[PDB]
Amino acid sequence: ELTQSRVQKIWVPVDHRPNSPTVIVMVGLPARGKTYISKKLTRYLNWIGVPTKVFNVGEYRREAVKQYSSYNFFRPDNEEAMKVRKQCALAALRDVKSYLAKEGGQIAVFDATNTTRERRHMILHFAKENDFKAFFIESVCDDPTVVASNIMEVKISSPDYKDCNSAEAMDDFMKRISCYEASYQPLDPDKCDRDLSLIKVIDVGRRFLVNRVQDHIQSRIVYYLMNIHVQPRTIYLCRHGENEHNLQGRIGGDSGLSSRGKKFASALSKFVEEQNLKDLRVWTSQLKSTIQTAEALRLPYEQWKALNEIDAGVCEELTYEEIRDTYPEEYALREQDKYYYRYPTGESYQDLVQRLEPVIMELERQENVLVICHQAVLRCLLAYFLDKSAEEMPYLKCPLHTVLKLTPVAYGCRVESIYLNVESVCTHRERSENPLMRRN
Amino acid sequence: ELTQSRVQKIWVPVDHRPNSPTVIVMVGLPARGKTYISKKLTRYLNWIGVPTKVFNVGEYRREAVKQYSSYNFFRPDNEEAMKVRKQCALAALRDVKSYLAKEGGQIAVFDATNTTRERRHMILHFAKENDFKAFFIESVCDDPTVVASNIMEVKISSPDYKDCNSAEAMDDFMKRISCYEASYQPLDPDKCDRDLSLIKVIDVGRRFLVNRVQDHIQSRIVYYLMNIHVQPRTIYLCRHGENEHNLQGRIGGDSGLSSRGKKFASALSKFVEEQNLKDLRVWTSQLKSTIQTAEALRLPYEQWKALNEIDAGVCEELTYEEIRDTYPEEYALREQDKYYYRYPTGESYQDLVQRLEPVIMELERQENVLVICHQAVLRCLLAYFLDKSAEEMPYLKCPLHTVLKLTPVAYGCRVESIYLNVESVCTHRERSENPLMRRN
Numbered sequence: 001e002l003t004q005s006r007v008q009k010i011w012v013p014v015d016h017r018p019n020s021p022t023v024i025v026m027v028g029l030p031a032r033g034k035t036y037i038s039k040k041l042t043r044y045l046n047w048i049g050v051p052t053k054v055f056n057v058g059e060y061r062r063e064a065v066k067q068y069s070s071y072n073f074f075r076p077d078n079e080e081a082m083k084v085r086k087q088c089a090l091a092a093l094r095d096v097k098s099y100l101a102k103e104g105g106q107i108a109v110f111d112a113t114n115t116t117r118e119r120r121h122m123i124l125h126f127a128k129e130n131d132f133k134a135f136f137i138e139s140v141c142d143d144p145t146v147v148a149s150n151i152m153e154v155k156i157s158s159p160d161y162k163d164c165n166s167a168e169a170m171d172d173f174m175k176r177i178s179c180y181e182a183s184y185q186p187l188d189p190d191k192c193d194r195d196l197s198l199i200k201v202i203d204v205g206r207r208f209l210v211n212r213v214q215d216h217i218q219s220r221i222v223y224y225l226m227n228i229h230v231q232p233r234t235i236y237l238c239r240h241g242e243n244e245h246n247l248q249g250r251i252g253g254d255s256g257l258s259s260r261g262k263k264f265a266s267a268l269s270k271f272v273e274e275q276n277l278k279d280l281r282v283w284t285s286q287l288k289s290t291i292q293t294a295e296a297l298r299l300p301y302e303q304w305k306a307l308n309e310i311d312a313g314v315c316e317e318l319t320y321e322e323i324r325d326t327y328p329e330e331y332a333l334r335e336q337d338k339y340y341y342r343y344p345t346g347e348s349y350q351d352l353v354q355r356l357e358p359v360i361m362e363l364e365r366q367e368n369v370l371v372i373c374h375q376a377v378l379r380c381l382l383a384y385f386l387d388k389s390a391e392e393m394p395y396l397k398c399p400l401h402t403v404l405k406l407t408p409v410a411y412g413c414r415v416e417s418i419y420l421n422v423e424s425v426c427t428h429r430e431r432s433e434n435p436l437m438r439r440n
Numbered sequence: 441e442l443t444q445s446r447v448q449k450i451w452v453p454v455d456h457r458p459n460s461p462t463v464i465v466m467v468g469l470p471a472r473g474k475t476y477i478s479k480k481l482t483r484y485l486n487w488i489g490v491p492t493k494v495f496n497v498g499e500y501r502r503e504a505v506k507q508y509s510s511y512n513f514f515r516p517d518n519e520e521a522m523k524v525r526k527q528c529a530l531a532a533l534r535d536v537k538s539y540l541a542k543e544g545g546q547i548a549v550f551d552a553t554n555t556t557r558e559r560r561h562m563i564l565h566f567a568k569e570n571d572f573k574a575f576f577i578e579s580v581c582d583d584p585t586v587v588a589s590n591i592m593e594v595k596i597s598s599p600d601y602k603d604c605n606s607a608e609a610m611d612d613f614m615k616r617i618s619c620y621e622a623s624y625q626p627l628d629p630d631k632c633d634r635d636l637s638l639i640k641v642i643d644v645g646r647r648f649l650v651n652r653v654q655d656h657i658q659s660r661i662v663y664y665l666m667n668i669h670v671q672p673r674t675i676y677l678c679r680h681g682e683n684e685h686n687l688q689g690r691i692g693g694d695s696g697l698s699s700r701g702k703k704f705a706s707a708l709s710k711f712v713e714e715q716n717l718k719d720l721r722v723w724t725s726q727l728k729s730t731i732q733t734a735e736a737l738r739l740p741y742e743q744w745k746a747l748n749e750i751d752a753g754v755c756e757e758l759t760y761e762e763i764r765d766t767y768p769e770e771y772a773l774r775e776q777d778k779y780y781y782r783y784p785t786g787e788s789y790q791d792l793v794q795r796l797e798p799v800i801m802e803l804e805r806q807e808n809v810l811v812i813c814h815q816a817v818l819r820c821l822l823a824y825f826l827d828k829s830a831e832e833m834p835y836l837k838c839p840l841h842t843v844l845k846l847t848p849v850a851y852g853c854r855v856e857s858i859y860l861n862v863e864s865v866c867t868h869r870e871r872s873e874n875p876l877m878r879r880n
């Protein structure tokens with residue numbers, strides 16, 4: 001007969017009491033970007049609501065072996081270490097099983113060189129017997145400058161190399177790489193790996209070989225992998241300059257900038273100029289206050305409906321007081337479950353994620369971008385860049401008049417905050433703190 | 441200082457008076473799906489708002505050569521026909537130039553075998569000198585059953601074979617294919633075509649080789665190409681059973697089914713059963729009336745916010761009369777420009793396109809799907825399947841209680857309409873038909 005759920009506003013059938021998880025398998029020599037792709041891809045998947053976890057076999061190794069000493073550990077003749085490495089893989093797999101079949105996880109990224117047919121064949125056997133789909137991602141790169149640079153960026157400052165300097169860490173890791181070169185069997189989609197679902201990423205994403213995509217979530221991953229790059233650049237995020245409803249503690253609406261909001265706009269101009277960016281895309285919402293802010297910059301800017309602020313449904317243009325008083329039950333429900341709560345005839349943070357994915361996907365393709373937007377929206381994008389969970393995302397602090405400047409480092413993003421020194425109200429609201437439903 | 445445009449509600453700077461177009465190049469032997477990919481890809485691009493046109497060199501040929509007689513026309517020794525074919529290509533290119541540089545077009549799909557380096561090299565020269573990006577799409581398929589089947593489906597009933605039967609049309613076309621086999625040079629991304637942007641579609645999309653995507657619109661095309669298939673299936677589209685606001689001529693809202701809407705639901709059940717589909721996905725919106733309708737079917741169904749009806753902003757739940765009276769100017773603006781018009785704090789048909797693209801993209805991946813939805817939404821999806829322009833889309837007829845059953849045939853979709861014989865109101869509104877602003 002159907003009832004409308006109170007938080008999400010989803011119609012469900014009144015309950016009057018009387019698909020397959022995926023193991024993603026990274027493949028390739030060390031320092032080929034496997035961990036980087038693993039973390040980044042996991043970041044994306046979790047943010048769009050597909051629960052995903054990285055199993056880095058190296059971290060299992062570091063847990064079972066106290067202190068690393070040298071590449072001798074990795075030699076093919078090292079029978080004891082081969083026993084430990086195998087056991088490390090199997091222990092990681094056990095966890096994958098646990099995570100896909102008992103913990104709610106949907107994708108497990110199995111992050112190891114997985115460079116032999118023998119190793120892949122085993123992983124397949126394990127997928128098969130657990131009823132997991134398997135998908136392979138191989139990074140192929142024999143440009144020595146790339147390999148070298150990669151080693152400098154992430155390898156030499158690993159815990160393996162703690163009591164150790166650059167030149168010898170670098171030298172050791174080059175020998176660890178040679179250990180794997182002898183029996184490395186790349187994916188052969190053309191005959192032997194004919195039936196595997198895989199993508200082979202070649203020359204830092206200059207080229208792809210894609211073979212048998214088998215489902216919604218695989219085709220997404222491929223799309224994503226083909227749009228990210230590693231060129232250096234900067235993402236700036238901030239809100240529209242202070243607006244008039246800000247001044248009255250009113251949510252939503254389409255009000256213009258306060259005189260302070262305008263002073264922020266000029267400062268943002270000054271800030272942009274001093275950053276000395278050769279090019280810079282500017283994006284705004286379609287709400288006036290982000291566009292007026294962009295106008296202060298005298299640069300081409302592009303408006304996106306998707307960046308419009310969360311839609312507060314029938315609460316548009318009310319104060320939170322007015323909300324508490326007219327809709328106390330709604331007000332309380334939003335406080336209980338702020339990520340999933342949807343306003344009546346309006347949206348939840350969950351909805352924002354879904355409209356923002358194409359913004360994120362274009363952010364990934366671009367180089368320098370300034371995105372001028374709104375509180376909830378900004379939280380949602382920041383959660384993606386800083387890997388914040390659904391549960392922390394509605395509460396991230398995203399004040400007015402402040403640029404978040406995001407630069408890629410190692411495996412994620414450095415955030416620097418830069419306030420442009422123009423006052424405004426503060427619209428941040430922290431989380432909020434029953435005897436008579438019990439006998440005592 | 442900024443003013444809000446009256447139709448689209450876009451903030452633009454008050455005007456107080458004082459990138460590169462793409463040529464897509466199809467590559468491959470005849471009957472490899474080139475025209476099919478060309479038309480389908482064009483259909484997609486236009487619907488998402490990227491203006492795109494197919495230039496089929498064969499149609500130029502049919503215009504310059506009166507009546508086709510046989511494959512002798514295509515022989516490599518046929519010097520006169522080689523002059524005509526070349527001139528046909530160049531004339532198509534002239535049109536491409538005209539379309540990209542003078543007509544507003546953004547993508548031109550150059551649809552010919554384009555099987556030699558010499559031919560591609562020329563096309564490149566032409567792109568270069570006109571400042572067009574160039575992107576190549578090659579279909580490789582040497583499965584004789586596929587080639588044969590393809591010839592049966594689209595070739596034998598071409599105007600070339602008018603006074604001609606199956607067996608000899610088929611025989612002639614196999615020889616036309618052999619004409620091209622001798623100097624066919626496939627794209628070699630591995631050395632000679634190292635610098636071309638291309639995708640090589642292999643074995644009906646079992647496998648892809650992608651090389652140097654260079655922009656937003658290229659990566660989209662690839663994503664799209666990797667999600668379409670050619671397996672036989674059926675798409676059903678219909679509206680929620682009649683609802684209560686329907687009965688009062690009220691737009692929007694979230695009202696439940698009338699007793700007739702419920703009788704439709706049962707009939708839809710009966711209809712689904714008699715279709716005898718081995719599997720069938722069912723999708724609804726998150727509005728009650730589509731979900732109640734799906735409940736009548738007793739099948740798993742999945743709710744999509746993106747399928748929710750167009751949002752009429754501050755007109756939600758008004759009658760069109762109430763709209764005319766309270767917002768005559770809005771009412772008139774919507775009549776002037778119904779595709780682009782956006783309701784205040786609500787949406788336009790343009791917005792629906794953009795929320796619906798992921799629905800379309802998943803429709804392309806699926807097999808049997810029934811989508812139960814709403815008037816404007818249904819128009820938008822139908823426009824994509826039946827290739828209708830922006831301008832005709834807001835006016836397509838999508839009555840209550842009627843299934844549109846879409847089956848792939850040749851180069852697009854057959855539509856059959858099936859009414860389930862339960863009365864309802866009719867919510868269709870046709871298009872609507874100044875001396876005092878002039879001296880006489």
Ligand SMILES: Nc1ncnc2c1ncn2[C@@H]1O[C@H](COP(=O)(O)OP(=O)(O)O)[C@@H](O)[C@H]1O
Nearest residue numbers: 030031032033034035036141150153204205230
């Ligand atoms: N497709 C790629 N090919 C080569 N290097 C890459 C790729 N993607 C990212 N990288 C680089 O790899 C480095 C991280 O290496 P890591 O992911 O730890 O390698 P691995 O896990 O293969 O040992 C980063 O410097 C990043 O720029």
Ligand SMILES: Nc1ncnc2c1ncn2[C@@H]1O[C@H](COP(=O)(O)OP(=O)(O)O)[C@@H](O)[C@H]1O
Nearest residue numbers: 470471472473474475476581590593644645670
């Ligand atoms: N990737 C593909 N490989 C082979 N055949 C395909 C592919 N995609 C579509 N087809 C089939 O091609 C047929 C249409 O052929 P057409 O597009 O006119 O070929 P061409 O233009 O290469 O002569 C349809 O039957 C369709 O099923």
Ligand SMILES: O=P(O)(O)OC[C@H]1O[C@@](CO)(OP(=O)(O)O)[C@@H](O)[C@@H]1O
Nearest residue numbers: 030057058061085089112113114115
């Ligand atoms: O199981 P194999 O194929 O050895 O790969 C796991 C090993 O890969 C290594 C090799 O570098 O990766 P990582 O850089 O991920 O720490 C080892 O640390 C880890 O023990």
Ligand SMILES: O=P(O)(O)OC[C@H]1O[C@@](CO)(OP(=O)(O)O)[C@@H](O)[C@@H]1O
Nearest residue numbers: 470497498501525529552553554555
């Ligand atoms: O310029 P080329 O490479 O000959 O390709 C154009 C020719 O391709 C053909 C070969 O079949 O395609 P179509 O099937 O598109 O009509 C000819 O009709 C057309 O004249």
Ligand SMILES: O=P(O)(O)OC[C@H]1O[C@](O)(CO)[C@@H](O)[C@@H]1O
Nearest residue numbers: 251252309312374375376427429
């Ligand atoms: O989810 P929160 O914390 O209530 O913040 C969202 C609000 O912030 C604003 O951008 C300005 O306060 C409102 O328009 C929006 O409703």
Ligand SMILES: O=P(O)(O)OC[C@H]1O[C@](O)(CO)[C@@H](O)[C@@H]1O
Nearest residue numbers: 691692749752814815816867869
């Ligand atoms: O664009 P149109 O022709 O006004 O039709 C859209 C309307 O149709 C309905 O689905 C029902 O009439 C309304 O909810 C919606 O506003």
